[PDB]
mmCIF file of all heavy atoms in Angstrom:
data_model
loop_
_atom_site.group_PDB
_atom_site.id
_atom_site.type_symbol
_atom_site.label_atom_id
_atom_site.label_comp_id
_atom_site.label_asym_id
_atom_site.label_seq_id
_atom_site.Cartn_x
_atom_site.Cartn_y
_atom_site.Cartn_z
ATOM 1 N N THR D 54 -17.007 46.425 42.035
ATOM 2 C CA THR D 54 -17.582 46.599 40.691
ATOM 3 C C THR D 54 -18.187 45.326 40.128
ATOM 4 O O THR D 54 -19.090 45.376 39.228
ATOM 5 C CB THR D 54 -16.573 47.254 39.764
ATOM 6 O OG1 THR D 54 -17.136 47.175 38.395
ATOM 7 C CG2 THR D 54 -15.295 46.369 39.750
ATOM 8 N N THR D 55 -17.763 44.115 40.623
ATOM 9 C CA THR D 55 -18.440 42.979 40.345
ATOM 10 C C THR D 55 -18.674 41.858 41.484
ATOM 11 O O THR D 55 -18.823 40.729 41.417
ATOM 12 C CB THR D 55 -17.482 42.130 39.254
ATOM 13 O OG1 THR D 55 -16.242 41.859 40.059
ATOM 14 C CG2 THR D 55 -17.241 42.965 37.994
ATOM 15 N N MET D 56 -18.584 42.471 42.544
ATOM 16 C CA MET D 56 -18.878 41.842 43.894
ATOM 17 C C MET D 56 -18.146 40.434 44.074
ATOM 18 O O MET D 56 -18.860 39.490 44.265
ATOM 19 C CB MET D 56 -20.469 41.532 43.782
ATOM 20 C CG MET D 56 -21.188 42.814 43.487
ATOM 21 S SD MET D 56 -21.277 44.072 44.750
ATOM 22 C CE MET D 56 -22.516 43.347 45.711
ATOM 23 N N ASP D 57 -16.832 40.432 43.979
ATOM 24 C CA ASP D 57 -16.082 39.278 44.112
ATOM 25 C C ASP D 57 -14.677 39.637 44.599
ATOM 26 O O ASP D 57 -14.310 40.884 44.544
ATOM 27 C CB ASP D 57 -16.089 38.521 42.901
ATOM 28 C CG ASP D 57 -15.476 39.285 41.760
ATOM 29 O OD1 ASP D 57 -15.418 40.505 41.900
ATOM 30 O OD2 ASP D 57 -14.953 38.632 40.757
ATOM 31 N N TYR D 58 -13.948 38.668 45.031
ATOM 32 C CA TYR D 58 -12.529 38.830 45.480
ATOM 33 C C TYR D 58 -11.756 37.584 45.082
ATOM 34 O O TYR D 58 -12.460 36.601 45.050
ATOM 35 C CB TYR D 58 -12.398 39.091 46.872
ATOM 36 C CG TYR D 58 -12.886 38.035 47.827
ATOM 37 C CD1 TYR D 58 -11.954 37.050 48.294
ATOM 38 C CD2 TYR D 58 -14.258 37.863 48.244
ATOM 39 C CE1 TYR D 58 -12.458 36.070 49.131
ATOM 40 C CE2 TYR D 58 -14.599 36.886 49.089
ATOM 41 C CZ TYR D 58 -13.721 35.915 49.521
ATOM 42 O OH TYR D 58 -14.096 34.989 50.459
ATOM 43 N N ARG D 59 -10.380 37.766 44.879
ATOM 44 C CA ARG D 59 -9.610 36.618 44.530
ATOM 45 C C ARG D 59 -8.604 36.128 45.736
ATOM 46 O O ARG D 59 -8.031 37.126 46.215
ATOM 47 C CB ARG D 59 -8.794 36.918 43.343
ATOM 48 C CG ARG D 59 -7.641 36.087 42.996
ATOM 49 C CD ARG D 59 -7.191 36.280 41.605
ATOM 50 N NE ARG D 59 -6.743 37.586 41.309
ATOM 51 C CZ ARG D 59 -6.501 38.082 40.079
ATOM 52 N NH1 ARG D 59 -6.270 37.318 39.017
ATOM 53 N NH2 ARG D 59 -6.165 39.252 39.892
ATOM 54 N N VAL D 60 -8.620 34.890 45.925
ATOM 55 C CA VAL D 60 -7.752 34.362 47.155
ATOM 56 C C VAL D 60 -7.071 33.224 46.662
ATOM 57 O O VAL D 60 -7.610 32.388 45.929
ATOM 58 C CB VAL D 60 -8.646 34.145 48.320
ATOM 59 C CG1 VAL D 60 -9.720 33.172 47.974
ATOM 60 C CG2 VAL D 60 -7.819 33.716 49.428
ATOM 61 N N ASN D 61 -5.791 33.183 46.933
ATOM 62 C CA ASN D 61 -4.879 32.079 46.733
ATOM 63 C C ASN D 61 -4.772 31.203 48.068
ATOM 64 O O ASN D 61 -4.241 31.792 48.992
ATOM 65 C CB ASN D 61 -3.528 32.445 46.207
ATOM 66 C CG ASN D 61 -2.682 31.420 45.685
ATOM 67 O OD1 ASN D 61 -1.850 30.798 46.374
ATOM 68 N ND2 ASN D 61 -2.844 30.991 44.395
ATOM 69 N N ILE D 62 -5.033 29.859 48.080
ATOM 70 C CA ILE D 62 -5.127 29.013 49.147
ATOM 71 C C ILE D 62 -4.454 27.787 49.006
ATOM 72 O O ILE D 62 -4.138 27.345 47.790
ATOM 73 C CB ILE D 62 -6.524 28.763 49.592
ATOM 74 C CG1 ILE D 62 -7.228 27.860 48.657
ATOM 75 C CG2 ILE D 62 -7.398 30.022 49.860
ATOM 76 C CD1 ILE D 62 -8.683 27.417 49.009
ATOM 77 N N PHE D 63 -4.002 27.131 49.961
ATOM 78 C CA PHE D 63 -3.403 25.863 50.142
ATOM 79 C C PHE D 63 -4.546 24.977 50.708
ATOM 80 O O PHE D 63 -4.431 24.791 51.989
ATOM 81 C CB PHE D 63 -2.036 25.704 50.887
ATOM 82 C CG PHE D 63 -0.903 26.580 50.267
ATOM 83 C CD1 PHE D 63 0.087 26.892 51.065
ATOM 84 C CD2 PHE D 63 -0.999 27.042 48.800
ATOM 85 C CE1 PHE D 63 1.158 27.663 50.587
ATOM 86 C CE2 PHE D 63 0.050 27.707 48.485
ATOM 87 C CZ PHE D 63 1.146 28.016 49.356
ATOM 88 N N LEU D 64 -5.411 24.452 50.027
ATOM 89 C CA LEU D 64 -6.453 23.584 50.534
ATOM 90 C C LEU D 64 -5.931 22.270 50.904
ATOM 91 O O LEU D 64 -5.316 21.536 50.109
ATOM 92 C CB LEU D 64 -7.564 23.485 49.439
ATOM 93 C CG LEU D 64 -8.900 22.861 49.953
ATOM 94 C CD1 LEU D 64 -9.955 23.445 49.251
ATOM 95 C CD2 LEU D 64 -8.826 21.345 49.700
ATOM 96 N N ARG D 65 -6.108 21.757 52.123
ATOM 97 C CA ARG D 65 -5.716 20.521 52.639
ATOM 98 C C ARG D 65 -6.913 19.717 53.055
ATOM 99 O O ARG D 65 -8.032 20.254 53.442
ATOM 100 C CB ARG D 65 -4.783 20.702 53.842
ATOM 101 C CG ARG D 65 -3.450 21.245 53.470
ATOM 102 C CD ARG D 65 -2.512 21.297 54.740
ATOM 103 N NE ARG D 65 -1.227 21.957 54.415
ATOM 104 C CZ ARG D 65 -0.362 22.248 55.312
ATOM 105 N NH1 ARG D 65 -0.592 21.945 56.631
ATOM 106 N NH2 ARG D 65 0.853 22.843 55.019
ATOM 107 N N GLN D 66 -6.802 18.478 53.117
ATOM 108 C CA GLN D 66 -7.862 17.638 53.577
ATOM 109 C C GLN D 66 -7.213 16.215 53.970
ATOM 110 O O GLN D 66 -6.530 15.670 53.359
ATOM 111 C CB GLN D 66 -8.976 17.330 52.473
ATOM 112 C CG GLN D 66 -8.366 17.285 51.032
ATOM 113 C CD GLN D 66 -9.500 17.460 50.095
ATOM 114 O OE1 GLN D 66 -10.657 17.494 50.479
ATOM 115 N NE2 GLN D 66 -9.183 17.680 48.921
ATOM 116 N N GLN D 67 -7.601 15.803 55.222
ATOM 117 C CA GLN D 67 -7.162 14.562 55.831
ATOM 118 C C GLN D 67 -8.365 13.649 56.091
ATOM 119 O O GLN D 67 -9.388 14.004 56.531
ATOM 120 C CB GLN D 67 -6.450 14.800 57.173
ATOM 121 C CG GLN D 67 -5.534 16.015 57.130
ATOM 122 C CD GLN D 67 -5.029 16.205 58.501
ATOM 123 O OE1 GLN D 67 -5.117 15.440 59.492
ATOM 124 N NE2 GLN D 67 -4.280 17.411 58.640
ATOM 125 N N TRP D 68 -8.185 12.441 55.542
ATOM 126 C CA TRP D 68 -9.184 11.411 55.682
ATOM 127 C C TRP D 68 -8.575 9.940 55.879
ATOM 128 O O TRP D 68 -7.418 9.669 55.440
ATOM 129 C CB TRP D 68 -10.319 11.322 54.646
ATOM 130 C CG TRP D 68 -9.872 10.822 53.338
ATOM 131 C CD1 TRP D 68 -10.181 9.426 53.038
ATOM 132 C CD2 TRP D 68 -9.188 11.465 52.253
ATOM 133 N NE1 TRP D 68 -9.504 9.223 51.750
ATOM 134 C CE2 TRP D 68 -9.096 10.439 51.283
ATOM 135 C CE3 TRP D 68 -8.822 12.801 52.096
ATOM 136 C CZ2 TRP D 68 -8.482 10.715 49.947
ATOM 137 C CZ3 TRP D 68 -8.070 12.995 50.795
ATOM 138 C CH2 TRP D 68 -7.923 11.931 49.868
#
Side-chain angles (χ1 to χ4, degrees):
Chain D
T54 176
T55 59
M56 315 285 286
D57 59 339
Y58 64 94
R59 168 164 51 184
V60 57
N61 189 266
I62 68 177
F63 297 160
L64 188 145
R65 293 182 183 174
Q66 35 196 352
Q67 316 174 9
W68 78 90

